Amino acid sequence: APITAYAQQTRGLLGCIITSLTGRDKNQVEGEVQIVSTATQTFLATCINGVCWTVYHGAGTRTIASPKGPVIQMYTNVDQDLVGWPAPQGSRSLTPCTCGSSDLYLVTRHADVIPVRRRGDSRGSLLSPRPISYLKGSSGGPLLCPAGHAVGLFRAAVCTRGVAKAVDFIPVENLETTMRS
Amino acid sequence: QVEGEVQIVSTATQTFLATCINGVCWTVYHGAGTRTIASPKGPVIQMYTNVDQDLVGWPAPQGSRSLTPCTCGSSDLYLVTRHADVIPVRRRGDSRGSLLSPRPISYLKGSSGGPLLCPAGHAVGLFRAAVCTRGVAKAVDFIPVENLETTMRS
C-alpha cells in the first residue's frame, strides 16, 4: 500500500500559548507525527519505537506539555541536533527501516509526501524540487522507505535561490547512538 | 468538510470512477462519453475530450481535492477500486501493469477512471480496463498521467 497522509489542527494560537505556560495538555493524541510549537516556531515530531523525536534547533532544552504536566526529555544530543520524549499516550510509532532502500519519501507538515533519492547517509535529493517555503515547519518529520518504515528525520533543506534541491536528514542510526549515551 | 480526490460516478446505465488531477476531474470516455457533469448550478461541459486516449475531463466539483502527478519513476503501483480496496500492480509498460495477485473480474468492476498510485500516493495513471482471462483479471490497461498532462497543455 502507498504512503498517504492527512493533517489535522487540534489547537489554535491562544490555546497553544496557555498550554505552553502551564505545561498541561488535556487533548487526545493520535497519529505517528505530531505538529509541534513553541512561542517562536512550529515544526514536527515523529514517533519511532515508543519515543517522540524532534530537532534540537526547534525544541532546545524544553519540556513537552502532557496530560500530567510538563515532561522532561529522555534523550538530548546537541551535536546530532536531536531530542526525544516518551511518546505521548495515544500516539502510534513508526519502526526503523530494515530493507536497504534508497528511494525515500519525506512527509511535510501539510501532509504532502515528496520523493527523495538517498545520496549518502545524511543527504537526499528531491526528484522534483520545490520552493523552500513548501518545507517550512517540516523539521523533525519522517523520511520513509517504500514500506513506510523510518529512515530518518528531516533536519534542513539544501537550497539555491530559494529552491530546495536536496535535504539533510538525521539517519535513524543516529537515534540508536543517541539512545546509547 | 473533508475532501476526496476520487469520485464515484454514474450514468443511467453504468457506474464508474473519476479522479481529480491538476484542477480537472478526469474519467474514461467509454463511461462518460460526451456527457455533462451534474452540479447544483446545472450541467457543466467537458473541458477536455480525447477519444483516442479514452479520456474526458470536467472542472473539478465542490468537495474534491487534486491528486499530484507521479514524478518519481516507480513501477510499484496501487490501484484504488470503487470499494476503496487497494490492489498492488507492477508496471509492465507505459500503459500496462500486472496484478501481483490476480482477482475475479467483479472485484474491479465499476472502477475505471480510478487512480493508479505510486508508493508516494501520487497519480501514475487512470485505470482504463481490466485485462481478463476466463473471468480473472491479472493485468490492467491505464492512461498514463503524461497523456493527461499533454491533453491540458494542448
Binding site: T4, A5, Y6, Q8, A111 | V2, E3, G4, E5, V6, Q7, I8, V9, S10, T11, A12, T15, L17, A18, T27, G31, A32, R35, T36, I37, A38, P43, P61, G63, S64, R65, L67, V80, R82, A84, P115, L117, G121
Partner: peptide, 16 residues
C-alpha cells in the same frame, strides 16, 4: 443525461 456524483473517496482515509 449528465454524469452524477454518487460518492467520494478520500485516499488518506481522513475522517469527518
Amino acid at each position: 443525461g449528465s454524469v452524477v456524483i454518487v460518492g467520494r473517496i478520500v485516499l488518506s482515509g481522513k475522517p469527518a
